[PDB]
Structures are given as structure tokens and as C-alpha cells.
PDB file of C-alpha atoms (C1' of nucleotides) and ligand atoms in Angstrom:
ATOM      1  CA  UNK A   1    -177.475   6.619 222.128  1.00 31.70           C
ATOM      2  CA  UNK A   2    -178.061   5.444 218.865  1.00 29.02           C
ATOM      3  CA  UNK A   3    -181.307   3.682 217.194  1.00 26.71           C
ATOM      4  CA  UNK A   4    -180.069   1.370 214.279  1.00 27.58           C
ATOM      5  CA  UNK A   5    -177.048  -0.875 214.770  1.00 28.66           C
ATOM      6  CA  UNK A   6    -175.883  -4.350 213.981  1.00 28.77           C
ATOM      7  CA  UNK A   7    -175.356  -7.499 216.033  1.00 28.41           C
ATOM      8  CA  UNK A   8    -173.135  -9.812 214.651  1.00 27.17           C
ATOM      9  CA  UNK A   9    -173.401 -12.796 216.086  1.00 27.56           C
ATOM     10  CA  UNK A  10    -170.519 -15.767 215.380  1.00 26.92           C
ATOM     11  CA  UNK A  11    -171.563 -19.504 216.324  1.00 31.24           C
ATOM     12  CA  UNK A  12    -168.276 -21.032 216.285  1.00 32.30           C
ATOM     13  CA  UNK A  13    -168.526 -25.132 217.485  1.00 31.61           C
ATOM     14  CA  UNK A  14    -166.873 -24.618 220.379  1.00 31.77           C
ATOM     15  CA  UNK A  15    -168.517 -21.459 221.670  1.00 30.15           C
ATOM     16  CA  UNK A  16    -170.505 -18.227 220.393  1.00 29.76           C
ATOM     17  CA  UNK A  17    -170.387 -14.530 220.715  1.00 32.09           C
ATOM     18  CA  UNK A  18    -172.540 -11.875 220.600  1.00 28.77           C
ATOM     19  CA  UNK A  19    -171.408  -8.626 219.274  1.00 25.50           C
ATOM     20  CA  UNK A  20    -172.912  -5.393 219.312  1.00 28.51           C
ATOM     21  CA  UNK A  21    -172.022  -2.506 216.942  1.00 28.02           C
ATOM     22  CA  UNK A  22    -172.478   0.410 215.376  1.00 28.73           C
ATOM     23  CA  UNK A  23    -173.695   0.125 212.006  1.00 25.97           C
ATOM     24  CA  UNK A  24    -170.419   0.839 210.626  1.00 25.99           C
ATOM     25  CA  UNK A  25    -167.342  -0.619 212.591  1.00 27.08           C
ATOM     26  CA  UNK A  26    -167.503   0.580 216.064  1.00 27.45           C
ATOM     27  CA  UNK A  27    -168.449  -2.271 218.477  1.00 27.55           C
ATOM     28  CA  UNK A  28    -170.191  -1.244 221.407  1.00 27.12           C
ATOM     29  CA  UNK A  29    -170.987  -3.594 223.747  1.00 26.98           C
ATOM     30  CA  UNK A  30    -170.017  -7.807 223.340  1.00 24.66           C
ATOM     31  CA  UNK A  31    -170.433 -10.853 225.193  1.00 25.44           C
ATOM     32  CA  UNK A  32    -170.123 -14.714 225.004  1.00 26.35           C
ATOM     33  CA  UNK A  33    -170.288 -17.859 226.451  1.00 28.57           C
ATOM     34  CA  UNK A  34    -167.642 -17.853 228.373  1.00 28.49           C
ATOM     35  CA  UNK A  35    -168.024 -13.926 230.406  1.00 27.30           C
ATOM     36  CA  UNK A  36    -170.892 -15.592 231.219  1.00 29.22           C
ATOM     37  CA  UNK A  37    -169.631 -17.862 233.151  1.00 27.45           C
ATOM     38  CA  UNK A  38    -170.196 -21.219 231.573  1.00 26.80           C
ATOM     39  CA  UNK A  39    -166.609 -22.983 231.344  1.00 28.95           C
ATOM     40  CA  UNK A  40    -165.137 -26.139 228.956  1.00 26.33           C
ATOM     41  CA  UNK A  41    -167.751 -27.795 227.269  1.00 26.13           C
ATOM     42  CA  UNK A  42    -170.591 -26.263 228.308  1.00 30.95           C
ATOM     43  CA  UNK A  43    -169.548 -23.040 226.141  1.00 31.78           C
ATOM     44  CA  UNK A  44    -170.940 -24.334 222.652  1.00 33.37           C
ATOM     45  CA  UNK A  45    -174.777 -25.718 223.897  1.00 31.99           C
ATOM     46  CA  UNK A  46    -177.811 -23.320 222.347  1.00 32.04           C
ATOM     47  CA  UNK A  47    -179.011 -22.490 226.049  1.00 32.15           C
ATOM     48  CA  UNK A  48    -175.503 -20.921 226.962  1.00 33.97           C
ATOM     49  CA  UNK A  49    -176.091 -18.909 223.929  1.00 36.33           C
ATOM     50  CA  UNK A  50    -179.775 -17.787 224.451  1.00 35.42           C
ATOM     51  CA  UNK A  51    -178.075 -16.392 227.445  1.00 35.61           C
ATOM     52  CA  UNK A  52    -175.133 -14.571 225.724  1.00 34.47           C
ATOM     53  CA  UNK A  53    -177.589 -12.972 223.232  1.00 35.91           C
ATOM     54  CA  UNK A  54    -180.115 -12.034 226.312  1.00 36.11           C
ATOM     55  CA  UNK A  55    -177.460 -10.357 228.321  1.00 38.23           C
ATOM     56  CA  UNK A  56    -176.482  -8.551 225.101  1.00 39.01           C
ATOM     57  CA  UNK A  57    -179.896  -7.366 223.932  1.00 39.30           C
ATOM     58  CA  UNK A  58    -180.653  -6.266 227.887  1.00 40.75           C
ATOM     59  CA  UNK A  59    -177.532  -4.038 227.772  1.00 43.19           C
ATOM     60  CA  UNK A  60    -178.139  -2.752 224.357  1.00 44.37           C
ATOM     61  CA  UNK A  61    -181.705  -2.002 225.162  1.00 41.93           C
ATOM     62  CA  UNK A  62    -180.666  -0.158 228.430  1.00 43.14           C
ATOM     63  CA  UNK A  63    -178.445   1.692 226.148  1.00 43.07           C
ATOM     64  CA  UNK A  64    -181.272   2.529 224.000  1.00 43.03           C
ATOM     65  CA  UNK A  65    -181.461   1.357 220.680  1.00 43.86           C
ATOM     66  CA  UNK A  66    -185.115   0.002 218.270  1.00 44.12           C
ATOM     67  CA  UNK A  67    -183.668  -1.119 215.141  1.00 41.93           C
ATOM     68  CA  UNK A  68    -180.778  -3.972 214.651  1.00 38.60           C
ATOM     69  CA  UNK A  69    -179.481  -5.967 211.237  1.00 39.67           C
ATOM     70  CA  UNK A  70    -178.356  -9.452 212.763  1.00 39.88           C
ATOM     71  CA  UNK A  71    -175.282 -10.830 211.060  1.00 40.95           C
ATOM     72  CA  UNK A  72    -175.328 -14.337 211.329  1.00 39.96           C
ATOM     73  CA  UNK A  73    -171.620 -15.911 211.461  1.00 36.83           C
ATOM     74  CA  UNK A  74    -170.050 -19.309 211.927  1.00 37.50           C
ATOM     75  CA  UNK A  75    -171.925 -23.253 211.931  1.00 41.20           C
ATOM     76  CA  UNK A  76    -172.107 -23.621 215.125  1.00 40.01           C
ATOM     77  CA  UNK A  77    -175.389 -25.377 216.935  1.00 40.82           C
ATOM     78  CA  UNK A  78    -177.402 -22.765 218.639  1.00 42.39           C
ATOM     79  CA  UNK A  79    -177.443 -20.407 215.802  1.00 40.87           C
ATOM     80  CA  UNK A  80    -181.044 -20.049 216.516  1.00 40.56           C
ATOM     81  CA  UNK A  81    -180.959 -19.526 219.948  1.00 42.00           C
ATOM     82  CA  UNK A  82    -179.743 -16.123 219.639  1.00 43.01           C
ATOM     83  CA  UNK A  83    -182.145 -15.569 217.309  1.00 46.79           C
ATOM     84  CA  UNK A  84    -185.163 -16.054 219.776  1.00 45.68           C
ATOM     85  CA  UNK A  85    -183.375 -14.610 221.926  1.00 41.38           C
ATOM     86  CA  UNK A  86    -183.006 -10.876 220.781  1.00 43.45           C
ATOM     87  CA  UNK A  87    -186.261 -11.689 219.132  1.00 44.14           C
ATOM     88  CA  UNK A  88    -188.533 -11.836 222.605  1.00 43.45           C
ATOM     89  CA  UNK A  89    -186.019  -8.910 223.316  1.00 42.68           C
ATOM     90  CA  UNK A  90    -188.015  -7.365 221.144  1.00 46.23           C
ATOM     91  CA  UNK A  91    -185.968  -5.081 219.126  1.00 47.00           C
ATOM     92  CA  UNK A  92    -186.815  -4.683 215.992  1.00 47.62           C
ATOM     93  CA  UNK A  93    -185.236  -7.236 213.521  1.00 49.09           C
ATOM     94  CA  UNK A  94    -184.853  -5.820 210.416  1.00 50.39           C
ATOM     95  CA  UNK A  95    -182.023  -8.094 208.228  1.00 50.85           C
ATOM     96  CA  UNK A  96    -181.279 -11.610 208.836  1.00 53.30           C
ATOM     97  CA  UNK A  97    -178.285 -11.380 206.506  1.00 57.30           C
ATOM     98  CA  UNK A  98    -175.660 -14.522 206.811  1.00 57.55           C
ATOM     99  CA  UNK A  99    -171.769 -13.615 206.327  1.00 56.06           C
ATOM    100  CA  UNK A 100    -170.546 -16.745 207.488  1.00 56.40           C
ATOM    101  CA  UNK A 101    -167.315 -17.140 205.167  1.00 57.48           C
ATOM    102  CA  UNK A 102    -167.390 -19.193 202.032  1.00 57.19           C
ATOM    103  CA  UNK A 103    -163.854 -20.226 200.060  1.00 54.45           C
ATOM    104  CA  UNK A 104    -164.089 -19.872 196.528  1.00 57.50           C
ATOM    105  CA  UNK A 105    -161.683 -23.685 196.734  1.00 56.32           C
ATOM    106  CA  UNK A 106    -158.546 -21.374 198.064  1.00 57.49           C
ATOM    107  CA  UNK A 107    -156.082 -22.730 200.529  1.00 56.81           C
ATOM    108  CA  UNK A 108    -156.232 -25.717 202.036  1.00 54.75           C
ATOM    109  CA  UNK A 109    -157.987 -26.978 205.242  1.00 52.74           C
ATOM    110  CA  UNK A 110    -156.876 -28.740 207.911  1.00 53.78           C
ATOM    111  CA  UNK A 111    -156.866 -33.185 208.212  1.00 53.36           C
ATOM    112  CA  UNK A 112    -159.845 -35.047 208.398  1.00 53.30           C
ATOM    113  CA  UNK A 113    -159.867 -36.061 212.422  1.00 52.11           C
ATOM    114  CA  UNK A 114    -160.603 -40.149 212.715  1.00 51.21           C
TER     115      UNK A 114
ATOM    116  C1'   U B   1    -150.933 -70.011 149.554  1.00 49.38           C
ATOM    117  C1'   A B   2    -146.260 -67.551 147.681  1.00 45.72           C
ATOM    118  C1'   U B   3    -143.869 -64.768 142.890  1.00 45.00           C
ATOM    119  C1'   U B   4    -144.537 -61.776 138.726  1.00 45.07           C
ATOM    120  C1'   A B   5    -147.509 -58.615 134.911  1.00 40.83           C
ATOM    121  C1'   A B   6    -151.633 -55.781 135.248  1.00 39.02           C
ATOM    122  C1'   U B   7    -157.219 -53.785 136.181  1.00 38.60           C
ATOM    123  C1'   C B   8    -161.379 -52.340 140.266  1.00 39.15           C
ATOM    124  C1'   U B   9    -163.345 -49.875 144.692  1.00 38.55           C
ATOM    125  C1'   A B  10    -165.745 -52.150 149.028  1.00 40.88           C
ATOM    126  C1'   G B  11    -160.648 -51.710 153.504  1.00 41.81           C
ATOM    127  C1'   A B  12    -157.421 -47.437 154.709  1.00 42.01           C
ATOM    128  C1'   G B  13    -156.064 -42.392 153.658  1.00 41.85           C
ATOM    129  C1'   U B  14    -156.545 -37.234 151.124  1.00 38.70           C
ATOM    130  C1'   G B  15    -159.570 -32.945 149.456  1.00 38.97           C
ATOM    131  C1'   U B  16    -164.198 -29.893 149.823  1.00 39.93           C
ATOM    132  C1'   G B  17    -168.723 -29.012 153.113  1.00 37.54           C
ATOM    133  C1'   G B  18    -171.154 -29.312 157.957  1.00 36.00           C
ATOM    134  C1'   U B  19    -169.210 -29.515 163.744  1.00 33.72           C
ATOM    135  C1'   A B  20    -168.958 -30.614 169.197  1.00 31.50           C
ATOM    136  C1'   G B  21    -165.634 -30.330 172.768  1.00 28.17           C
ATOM    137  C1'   G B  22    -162.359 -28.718 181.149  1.00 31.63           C
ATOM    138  C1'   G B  23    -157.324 -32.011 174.385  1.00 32.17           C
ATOM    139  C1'   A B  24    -152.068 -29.486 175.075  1.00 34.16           C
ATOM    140  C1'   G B  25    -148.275 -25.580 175.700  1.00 32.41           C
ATOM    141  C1'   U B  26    -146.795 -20.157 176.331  1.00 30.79           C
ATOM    142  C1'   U B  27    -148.161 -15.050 178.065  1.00 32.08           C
ATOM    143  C1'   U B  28    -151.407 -11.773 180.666  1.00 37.26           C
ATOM    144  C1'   U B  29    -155.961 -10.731 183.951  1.00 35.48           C
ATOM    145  C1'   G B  30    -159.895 -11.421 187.981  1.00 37.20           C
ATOM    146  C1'   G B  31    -162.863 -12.371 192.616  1.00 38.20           C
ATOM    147  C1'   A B  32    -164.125 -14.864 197.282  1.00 38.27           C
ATOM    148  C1'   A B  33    -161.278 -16.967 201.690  1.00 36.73           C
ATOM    149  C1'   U B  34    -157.004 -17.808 205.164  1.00 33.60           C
ATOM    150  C1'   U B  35    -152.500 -15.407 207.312  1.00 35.77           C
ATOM    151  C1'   U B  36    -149.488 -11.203 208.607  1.00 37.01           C
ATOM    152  C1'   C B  37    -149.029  -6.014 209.170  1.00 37.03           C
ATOM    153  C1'   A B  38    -151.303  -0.792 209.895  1.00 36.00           C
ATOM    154  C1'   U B  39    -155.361   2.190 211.900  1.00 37.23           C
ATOM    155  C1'   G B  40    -160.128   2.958 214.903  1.00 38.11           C
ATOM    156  C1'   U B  41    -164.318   0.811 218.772  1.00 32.39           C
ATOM    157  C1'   G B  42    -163.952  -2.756 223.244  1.00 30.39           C
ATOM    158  C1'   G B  43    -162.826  -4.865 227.811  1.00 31.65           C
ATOM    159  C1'   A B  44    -161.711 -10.858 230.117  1.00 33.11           C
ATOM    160  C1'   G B  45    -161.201 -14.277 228.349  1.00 31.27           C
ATOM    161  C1'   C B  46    -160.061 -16.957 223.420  1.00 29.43           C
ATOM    162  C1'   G B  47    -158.648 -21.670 221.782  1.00 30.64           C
ATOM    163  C1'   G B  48    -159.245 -26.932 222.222  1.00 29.99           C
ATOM    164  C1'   U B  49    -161.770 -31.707 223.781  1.00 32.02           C
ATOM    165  C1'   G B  50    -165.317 -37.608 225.152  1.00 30.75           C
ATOM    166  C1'   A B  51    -163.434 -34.370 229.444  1.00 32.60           C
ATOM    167  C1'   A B  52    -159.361 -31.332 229.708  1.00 32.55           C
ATOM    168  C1'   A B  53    -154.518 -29.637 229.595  1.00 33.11           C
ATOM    169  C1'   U B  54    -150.211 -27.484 226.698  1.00 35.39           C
ATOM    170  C1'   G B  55    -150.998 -22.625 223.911  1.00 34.70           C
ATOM    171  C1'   C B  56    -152.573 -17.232 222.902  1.00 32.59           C
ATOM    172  C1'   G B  57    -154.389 -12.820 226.257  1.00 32.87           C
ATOM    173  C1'   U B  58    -154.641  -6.157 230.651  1.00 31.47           C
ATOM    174  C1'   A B  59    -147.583  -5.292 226.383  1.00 30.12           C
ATOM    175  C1'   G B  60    -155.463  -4.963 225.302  1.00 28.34           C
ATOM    176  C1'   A B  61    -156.508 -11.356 222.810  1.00 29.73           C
ATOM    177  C1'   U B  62    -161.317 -13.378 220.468  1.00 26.92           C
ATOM    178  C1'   A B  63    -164.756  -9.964 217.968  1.00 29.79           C
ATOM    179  C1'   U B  64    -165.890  -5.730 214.640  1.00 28.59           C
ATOM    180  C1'   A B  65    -164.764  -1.956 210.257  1.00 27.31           C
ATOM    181  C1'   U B  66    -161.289  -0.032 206.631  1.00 24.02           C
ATOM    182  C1'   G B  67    -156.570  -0.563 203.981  1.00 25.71           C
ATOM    183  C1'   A B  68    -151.983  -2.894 202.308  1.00 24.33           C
ATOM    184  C1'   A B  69    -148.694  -7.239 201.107  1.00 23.32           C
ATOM    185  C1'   G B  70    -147.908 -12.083 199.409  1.00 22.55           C
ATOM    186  C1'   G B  71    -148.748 -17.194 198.404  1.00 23.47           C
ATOM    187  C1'   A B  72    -151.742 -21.433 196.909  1.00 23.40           C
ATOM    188  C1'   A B  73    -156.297 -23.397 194.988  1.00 25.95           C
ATOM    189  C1'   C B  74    -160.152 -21.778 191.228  1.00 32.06           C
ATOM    190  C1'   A B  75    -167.710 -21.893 195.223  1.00 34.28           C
ATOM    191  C1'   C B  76    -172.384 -21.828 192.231  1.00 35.66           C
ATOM    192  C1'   C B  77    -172.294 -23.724 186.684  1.00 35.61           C
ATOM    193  C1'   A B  78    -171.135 -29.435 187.882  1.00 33.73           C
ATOM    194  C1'   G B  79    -174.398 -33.686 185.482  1.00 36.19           C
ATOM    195  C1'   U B  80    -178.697 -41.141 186.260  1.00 38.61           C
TER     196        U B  80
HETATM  197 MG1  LIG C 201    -157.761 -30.835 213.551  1.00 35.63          MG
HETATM  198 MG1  LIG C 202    -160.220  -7.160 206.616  1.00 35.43          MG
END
RNA sequence: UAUUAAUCUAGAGUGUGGUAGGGAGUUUUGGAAUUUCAUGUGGAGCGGUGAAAUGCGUAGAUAUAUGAAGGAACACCAGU
């Protein structure tokens, strides 16, 4: 019921998600990787998040909504995926703003795997 | 060469004039980010891996927005 909103959309390693929201706070609708039914590994390949972010945008659209802000979040792999994805959507992209976080060198991560 | 009695400025210092520095100690201040807590939206997973399983989750997690608390370290500048 409304025509602007954000989509926040986290690419974590391991797996993505695909947030809808109002454009302040709010979420309205989300999905991810694994509500759609891809399980272990398969979470955290680009194609399992094209669908994510198509299932998202379909519901979104159905709600009724033109103009979205996409928050890009995390370093995952298919970060572009959902991109694509809302973009043959077709609602209208207006920010491609990035808000993954960046330390400033505070606290300490964890050990270097090997 | 050593000792003694002296002179000299070229070694080494001192003064005046230019001058570059993340040199050191003490006392205040700041912003990102993690965590926890509080308050809203939301509804089945999140997390993790070579693949999974312990684990967290309908007592409403992950996510999202605002606020508070405290601790530690100080992106970019930053380098033939
Ligand atoms: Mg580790
Ligand atoms: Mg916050």
C-alpha cells in the first residue's frame, strides 16, 4: 500500500536475505535462502539468491509498490544476483547505496582458519 | 712515546639564527564497529561446513529502525 520503500538485502557467505521495508524501520515482507527451500550448502550460491530476491520483488509487487532504495549488505558471492533480480522485476531502482559495516580498527576479529 | 711549563683552532662542546618530525609521560575529548539491554514491524528458520552435526529459534530467532550502557582498538591519510 505504499510506493517507495527499501530492500535491504544482506549477502552473508553462508547464505543471503532479502528484506523488504518501509522506508523507515518497518519491515514488511522478507525472505532467504533457506524459506526457500534450499538446505546446507546450497544456501550461499548466486542462483539460490536470484530466487530469494524474485520471490521478494513478486510479493512486494503484488503488494503494490514502484519505487525501492536497495541497501546492499554483507560480502557474500551473489551480491549481484539480487540485483538482476529485482532489476527484470522491474521496479524502479532508485539508490544502490552499500551499508555493509566497516570497523574503524575496533575490537578484534576472530583466528585466521588454516 | 710518557712528564712538566705554556700558545693555537682544525676534533668535541656552548651561545645566537634558521627547522623537520606517529620521540616520551600526564590529563581531557571524539567517531565508526561488535555485544548486551529496551521499544516497534515480521513470521520459520538462523548459524556452521569439504559435507554436516553440536548450538540458537513460535517463550517470536536471523533481519530491519530508534535509543541506552560499557569495554577494547584508533578505517581513509599510510608511502619504491
Ligand atoms: Mg572461525
Ligand atoms: Mg542499533
Amino acid at each position: 500500500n505504499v510506493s517507495s520503500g527499501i530492500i535491504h538485502v544482506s549477502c552473508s557467505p553462508n547464505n543471503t536475505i532479502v528484506s523488504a521495508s518501509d522506508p523507515g524501520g518497518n519491515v514488511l515482507c522478507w525472505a532467504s535462502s533457506g524459506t526457500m527451500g534450499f538446505k546446507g550448502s546450497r544456501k550461499k550460491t548466486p542462483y539460490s539468491a536470484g530466487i530469494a530476491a524474485d520471490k521478494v520483488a513478486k510479493t512486494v509487487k503484488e503488494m503494490g509498490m514502484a519505487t525501492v532504495k536497495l541497501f546492499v549488505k554483507g560480502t557474500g558471492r551473489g551480491k549481484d544476483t539480487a540485483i538482476r533480480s529485482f532489476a527484470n522485476a522491474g521496479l524502479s531502482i532508485t539508490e544502490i547505496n552499500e551499508k555493509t559495516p566497516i570497523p574503524h580498527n575496533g575490537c578484534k576479529p576472530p583466528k585466521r582458519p588454516r
